[PDB]
RNA sequence: UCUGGCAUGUUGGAACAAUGUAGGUAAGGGAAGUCGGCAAGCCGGAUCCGUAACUUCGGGAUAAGGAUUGGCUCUAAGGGCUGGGCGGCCGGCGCCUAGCAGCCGACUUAGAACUGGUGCGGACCAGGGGAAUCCGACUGUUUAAUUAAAACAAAGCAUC
RNA sequence: UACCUGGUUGAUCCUGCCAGUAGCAUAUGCUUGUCUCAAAGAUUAAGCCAUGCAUGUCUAAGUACGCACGGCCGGUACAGUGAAACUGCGAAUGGCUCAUUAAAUCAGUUAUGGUUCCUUUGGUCGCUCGUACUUGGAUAACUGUGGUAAUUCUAGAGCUAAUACAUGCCGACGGGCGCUGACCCCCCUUCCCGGGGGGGGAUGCGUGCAUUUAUCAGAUGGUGACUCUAGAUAACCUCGGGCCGAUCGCACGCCCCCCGUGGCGGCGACGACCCAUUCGAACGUCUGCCCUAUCAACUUUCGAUGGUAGUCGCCGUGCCUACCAUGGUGACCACGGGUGACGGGGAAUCAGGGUUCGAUUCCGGAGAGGGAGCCUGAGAAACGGCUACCACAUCCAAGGAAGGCAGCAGG
RNA sequence: AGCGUAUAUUAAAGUUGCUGCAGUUAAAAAGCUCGUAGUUGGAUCUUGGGAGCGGGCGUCCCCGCCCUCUCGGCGGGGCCCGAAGCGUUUACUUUGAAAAAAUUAGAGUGUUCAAAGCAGGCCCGAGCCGCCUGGAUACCGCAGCUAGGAAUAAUGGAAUAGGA
RNA sequence: CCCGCCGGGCAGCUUCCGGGAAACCAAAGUCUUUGGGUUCCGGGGGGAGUAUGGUUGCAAAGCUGAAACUUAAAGGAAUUGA
RNA sequence: AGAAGACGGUCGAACUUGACUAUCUAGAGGAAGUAAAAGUCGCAACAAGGUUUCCGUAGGUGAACCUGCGGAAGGAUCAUUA
């Protein structure tokens, strides 16, 4: 290759992207932004494939320059903008607000939230550097660099940021006993409480997380995402509390629901 | 014993060997400041590395080197070089069809800092991956271990 | 070129025709000449590389093929002698020991910079080469005065 | 569904292979009523291509005096519909083929603390102390002229302009700091009169980020360790010059207070000096390939193995240069060659173990007849860019021009 | 609405034999010895004993039990073991972490069955100004990350004591 | 000299140990109820121990050693006759 | 500001020569291996095949073949008598 590839294929789409195989040889390539494309979602896929508001990619472009779609309080015309983790898309015409988070199946699900909840958010820091004129700054996973942070904030902490203000409201450190959600790997989409953590000087660290149902698991540091303090998340959660149930258990509830409905 | 054998005298960039002097005495009485720094993983800087008078840009302790990527080991066979010891590591590859293995070895060259002096033939040396400082050598010696040694007659 | 020797080899003067004897050069071809490359020409020294078939394993071999070569200014290496705590010496008091100091000396080799109209083994000296066939094994000898050869001899083999 | 039979015989037990026998891919042959999917020039020929096409593009928001239209209406001064062109951006993606390539590409894991990056986003853009209520020029289309056989051919004149090029201002903020510091004020020893200490301070040089440097403190931050991100001490800061708006639209408003026109104003777009993120980009650590000894001792005077000092290289190295004692590799298969070999994710078959096939539409690499080369661009050593050579060959008015369909059809 | 021939290849073929061959006479042991790669290399170092926790730790089958040294770290009494180590280092076994898409094993999905497709199913006086769900798992050889296991395979400790 | 015992042997002879296709053999056994270690060596019959390359030899020749092509049998043991 | 143009520095397409190496190819003539309808000598091996046979070496020969030195049983003889 002579440079940056400018296309994505139908099979080149990430697996958790629910895209059909027999519709086209290409895919809506997510363009550059605050998120790595491998764990983001374009606006077309969020609306056309999931919400069914539009049926063609052209119609998704029609509503975009109609300027009815907003992200983080900002109207973006990019149909392939990377709506990544902790992104809220609010449509004022229908008066609906959605918080983009993972479900129990490791999927970029759509979760309706109240407007008051959408006004604030949650972000995770990545690094601290003393930039210009000897003052600190924070660079996050959302690429929202913040000037003049609280000095008590360290690496791998979670900072609340408002849509309009764009500042630090409430920060929480990284510690045991805190609720967390996995942001990668096999355990993607699970909510649990950090019971243990082990370190390795020269490689990744392992954080052992044990959920409310006792299903313990282990995860890498880069896939740890802190949301709430203790055993209560700061934000609403989708169906299932982010608990991965087994194949046999899931089919048992599925058959019970089918029998009760019928 | 002269530190100045090369075409141009090598200088440690961090230290300042050049200092002013006071009345009734000189700075030459005290030894020059030496810049060194220990590493993690229990890689405690050995005695000869601190108190030695050698200067090396490529040493694990008095240089720019950061050891990362992978931590490995090997044995000592030959030492005919300028600050390089050739090492070889055994490893057994598995063949599925015949449900057995083959003995294999891929020897490499490691650059050894002059601080280590007590290395003989047939002992283990622990080395770690580093920057491509040479065309072939990409490892640096971090630890020296004997193998039925400590008594040579 | 010096020591020593000589007077150009049994004559001189003038001219510079043909033909000749001896020595050279020649555009473009490059053996088309001729019985035949006869004659002439090419190569040629030294240093550094690189050398085939075949073979009696010794050779063939300077095989073949290629590069360098001047002048000037430097650098490095290659040795000999003496000594070891006014004049001596009875002496512990010294310790030459990674061979140190002083003095002496000739011939080369290698490397580098600079430099000339790329010219330099500058004259002199000084192998053209390769692929094959025939004969004789080789070195040697022979018809002084037309035949130097495949002829003769030769070691080896055999016979009487 | 873990399978035989026939075949040496005067007949039988064995060894042993083939013949039949079951699937599997390419085509051939005879026939073929329907529909749902769907492979389809790779095999010898990565051989050559006539012809047609495959990259273009404008919002209220850069530039609009085109006699192509057109509203108000000729007292105004910038309407708009808009060819074409300048300006910025894409053309290095896509798609075809496997010629080439054998620890090499690639497959699993890791790093770039060893580097860079228009693109989207998040910061910053009064941080520096020294004509502005808008600067100079030509160049477009266009008109008027011309050349041949010519093109995606074009010089000379009058014009016009850009978010194109070059230069550049006031504001912006009153001051601090380190030195150099005249001068001025105060305190104490001193029986004397000299010193010992505090302060103001005019007048002078510097005093931001980006970059190059040399020095200091670092029980500001964090990593396990960077010579890290920070703070200062003294200079340069490239005229083949860095940053501090000479840019364009929308709806239009508030104040005359010390004033009949001055200030205050929002929504955006345009590229930045530097930092971060992402798409990425390339060089890297451990582990893995087919046949081959009728390839056994090989690399190294020409860089091969390493050190020191330099050169470029986006950065780290025999990438290159010079000096240093020889070193490295090899029967655990090197060096060499062949391959009817791009690799792998993967395909046929089946007790199990396994044997074969991998261009294919997927993820990476290479190529555009061949290997050379290069300007713009962030990213090319690019071929639907150019140059030269080699075969082939298009037009020629014989003075030249113009070329690569292993892109889609078709030959 | 197919079949044969032609050729490539697999099973057959225990006819390449690791699984899983043969060598007196059917093909075959070198004439023999040495010797290095390489291959394979004997036992031997904590086994039992009443632990009580559960059934038919009693005999027997599945669980931790009567590893250090430093602030007994949420200027000094038991309600503590977070981290600076390892009475040593490999191989193997299990889990866990690392797994670009498709295919394959296979969950559910109908209605022309399936091959295929990830879709569709669900009350309707229709104001029903439409609720819910799927789009999972398994394997991913080898190489490396990690936490245990400590039979099996080799390694050293201290013999002139340069011993803890 | 005779009687034995013990360990290392060259060995018969009988024997339904056993295996083997049998001839015959305590190894030519412990072999599908398949694994003690390992070397050399065979893969239907010919072509062919040939061609070519390499190496040894004074020669004759030795060691290493193919391919093209061609064949449905060549073979071992045993049965009764001649 | 600068077009045309010249000198020096680097790969270098391409060219010449030489060396090494791989593969594919002609060739007068020579000598083998493949099938044969079954053409000419007597008969080497199958019996003790009448000179058991086969193996190597050496040597010779129209040919099978003959000869010597050894070496075996695929020659008719597990035996040959104190």
């Amino acid at each position: 290759a002579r440079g940056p590839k400018k296309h994505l294929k139908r099979v080149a789409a990430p697996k958790h992207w629910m895209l059909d195989k027999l519709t086209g040889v290409f895919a809506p390539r997510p363009s550059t932004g605050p998120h790595k494309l491998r764990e983001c979602l374009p606006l077309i896929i969020f609306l056309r494939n999931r919400l069914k508001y539009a049926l063609t990619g052209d119609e998704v472009k029609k509503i975009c320059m109609q300027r009815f779609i907003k992200i983080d309080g900002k109207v973006r015309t990019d149909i392939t903008y990377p709506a990544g983790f902790m992104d809220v898309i609010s449509i004022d015409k229908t008066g609906e607000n959605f918080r983009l988070i993972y479900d129990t199946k490791g999927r970029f699900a759509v979760h309706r939230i109240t407007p008051e909840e959408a006004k604030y958010k949650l972000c995770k820091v990545r690094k601290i550097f003393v930039g210009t004129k000897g003052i600190p700054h924070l660079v996050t996973h959302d690429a929202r660099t913040i000037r003049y942070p609280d000095p008590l904030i360290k690496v791998n902490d979670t900072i609340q940021i408002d849509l309009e203000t764009g500042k630090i409201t409430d920060f929480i450190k990284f510690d045991t006993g805190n609720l967390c959600m996995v942001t990668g790997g096999a355990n993607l989409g699970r909510i649990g409480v950090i019971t243990n953590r082990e370190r390795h000087p020269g490689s990744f660290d392992v954080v052992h997380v044990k959920d409310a149902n006792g299903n313990s698991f282990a995860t890498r540091l880069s896939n740890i995402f802190v949301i709430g303090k203790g055993n209560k998340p700061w934000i609403s959660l989708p169906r299932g509390k982010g608990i991965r149930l087994t194949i046999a258990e899931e089919r048992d509830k599925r058959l019970a629901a089918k029998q009760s409905s019928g | 014993a002269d530190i100045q054998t090369e075409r141009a005298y090598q200088k440690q960039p961090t230290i300042f060997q050049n200092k002013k002097r006071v009345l009734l005495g000189e700075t030459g009485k005290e030894k020059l400041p030496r810049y060194y720094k220990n590493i993690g993983l229990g890689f405690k800087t050995p005695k000869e590395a601190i108190e030695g008078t050698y200067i090396d840009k490529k040493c694990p302790f008095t240089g720019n080197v950061s050891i990362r990527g992978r931590i490995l080991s090997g044995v000592v066979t030959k030492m005919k070089m300028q600050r390089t010891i050739v090492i070889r590591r055994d490893y057994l590859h598995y063949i599925r069809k015949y449900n057995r293995f083959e003995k294999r070895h891929k020897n490499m060259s490691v650059h050894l800092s002059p601080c280590f002096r007590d290395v003989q033939i047939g002992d283990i040396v622990t080395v770690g991956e580093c920057r491509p400082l040479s065309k072939t050598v990409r490892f640096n010696v971090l630890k020296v271990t004997k193998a039925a040694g400590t008594k040579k007659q």
Side-chain angles (χ1 to χ4, degrees):
Chain A
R2 282 186 281 176
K5 184 178 180 181
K6 300 183 175 183
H7 277 88
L8 279 206
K9 308 304 176 65
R10 38 161 262 202
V11 278
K15 179 56 178 290
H16 76 286
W17 282 19
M18 300 202 206
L19 297 181
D20 215 275
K21 271 229 258 165
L22 260 59
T23 76
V25 308
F26 279 134
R29 164 145 194 156
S31 303
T32 43
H35 297 264
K36 182 177 180 178
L37 320 169
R38 292 301 305 180
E39 288 284 338
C40 82
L41 189 66
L43 201 55
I44 311 173
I45 311 197
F46 167 75
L47 290 169
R48 172 193 60 194
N49 292 122
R50 304 295 176 80
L51 302 191
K52 190 253 203 327
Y53 287 168
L55 301 180
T56 57
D58 164 70
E59 272 179 352
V60 184
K61 306 146 130 186
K62 177 55 195 183
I63 60 184
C64 281
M65 336 313 155
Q66 282 286 345
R67 294 308 197 153
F68 305 153
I69 325 291
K70 295 179 178 178
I71 302 164
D72 195 64
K74 303 284 297 302
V75 195
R76 305 297 177 75
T77 180
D78 198 16
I79 39 178
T80 62
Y81 191 90
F85 194 48
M86 338 305 262
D87 283 15
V88 173
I89 299 178
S90 305
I91 324 294
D92 303 274
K93 290 304 180 179
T94 174
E96 309 298 332
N97 302 267
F98 316 96
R99 186 179 286 257
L100 295 180
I101 44 179
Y102 302 109
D103 81 325
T104 78
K105 301 175 189 194
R107 307 179 305 174
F108 198 85
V110 173
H111 166 56
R112 283 184 172 95
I113 56 176
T114 59
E116 40 267 8
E117 178 179 6
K119 299 309 147 219
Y120 77 99
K121 264 310 304 175
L122 217 36
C123 301
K124 269 204 101 141
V125 84
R126 290 293 189 79
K127 224 197 306 160
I128 319 174
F129 79 110
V130 179
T132 42
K133 310 200 81 172
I135 57 200
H137 328 279
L138 298 187
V139 279
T140 64
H141 78 273
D142 202 65
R144 193 167 303 283
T145 305
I146 303 299
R147 285 185 39 56
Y148 288 143
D150 195 304
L152 289 189
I153 305 174
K154 289 301 180 182
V155 197
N156 216 284
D157 292 358
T158 302
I159 271 57
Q160 179 168 334
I161 298 180
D162 326 293
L163 307 199
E164 288 84 19
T165 313
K167 286 184 56 52
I168 296 174
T169 299
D170 201 334
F171 72 96
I172 166 177
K173 260 273 304 176
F174 182 91
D175 200 20
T176 187
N178 293 265
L179 216 78
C180 69
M181 209 272 322
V182 193
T183 47
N187 294 301
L188 176 56
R190 310 185 77 181
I191 301 179
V193 152
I194 290 175
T195 308
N196 205 278
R197 172 187 172 182
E198 47 173 357
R199 293 186 181 177
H200 309 82
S203 188
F204 311 150
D205 296 352
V206 179
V207 172
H208 293 261
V209 182
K210 191 287 295 294
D211 76 322
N213 289 18
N215 307 330
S216 180
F217 50 96
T219 28
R220 47 174 55 233
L221 256 183
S222 63
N223 290 347
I224 302 300
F225 206 101
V226 182
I227 283 82
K229 183 54 207 83
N231 208 351
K232 292 179 178 179
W234 293 4
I235 65 185
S236 61
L237 297 185
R239 179 173 64 81
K241 193 248 170 156
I243 305 303
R244 176 172 299 185
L245 62 172
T246 71
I247 49 167
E249 289 175 8
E250 213 279 339
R251 263 60 175 97
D252 282 331
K253 325 303 210 241
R254 177 190 56 87
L255 292 182
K258 287 183 174 185
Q259 288 184 358
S260 62
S261 297
Chain B
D2 184 18
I3 308 171
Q4 322 191 13
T5 323
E6 294 85 4
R7 248 72 183 88
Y9 181 30
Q10 52 266 3
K11 319 159 189 176
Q12 297 195 183
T14 311
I15 70 177
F16 195 21
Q17 310 176 14
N18 326 117
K19 290 185 170 182
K20 265 77 64 174
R21 301 175 171 187
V22 300
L23 191 139
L24 196 64
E26 64 270 357
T27 189
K29 295 180 181 178
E30 62 176 4
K31 78 169 186 59
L32 86 167
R34 184 86 186 292
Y35 180 82
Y36 62 92
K37 55 182 202 300
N38 69 94
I39 331 100
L41 279 178
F43 279 106
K44 306 315 159 187
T45 314
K47 41 196 163 58
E48 198 70 48
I50 291 88
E51 70 196 10
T53 186
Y54 68 96
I55 283 189
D56 186 17
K57 182 229 154 153
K58 314 179 168 193
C59 163
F61 317 108
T62 187
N64 188 261
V65 67
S66 66
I67 273 74
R68 291 179 67 174
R70 211 180 295 257
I71 178 48
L72 299 323
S73 299
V75 288
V76 166
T77 47
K78 305 195 225 133
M79 333 207 192
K80 293 179 178 179
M81 250 294 177
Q82 281 180 13
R83 295 213 287 257
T84 306
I85 310 277
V86 74
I87 73 170
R88 165 191 155 183
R89 61 188 180 283
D90 297 351
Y91 72 109
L92 262 286
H93 178 214
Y94 167 69
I95 309 75
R96 172 50 258 163
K97 186 186 183 176
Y98 301 107
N99 197 31
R100 289 159 177 84
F101 317 90
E102 51 179 350
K103 162 157 43 168
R104 282 184 151 181
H105 73 271
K106 332 167 76 162
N107 63 341
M108 39 184 197
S109 294
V110 69
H111 163 58
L112 162 69
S113 170
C115 56
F116 300 86
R117 190 179 281 111
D118 304 340
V119 175
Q120 261 71 20
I121 166 179
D123 69 335
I124 321 98
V125 162
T126 302
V127 305
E129 176 210 349
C130 72
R131 68 217 159 188
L133 196 62
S134 188
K135 194 252 175 63
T136 302
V137 179
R138 283 86 142 84
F139 283 71
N140 296 138
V141 169
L142 262 48
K143 185 178 180 180
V144 160
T145 36
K146 293 308 191 67
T150 80
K151 175 226 162 270
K152 178 58 161 60
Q153 296 297 328

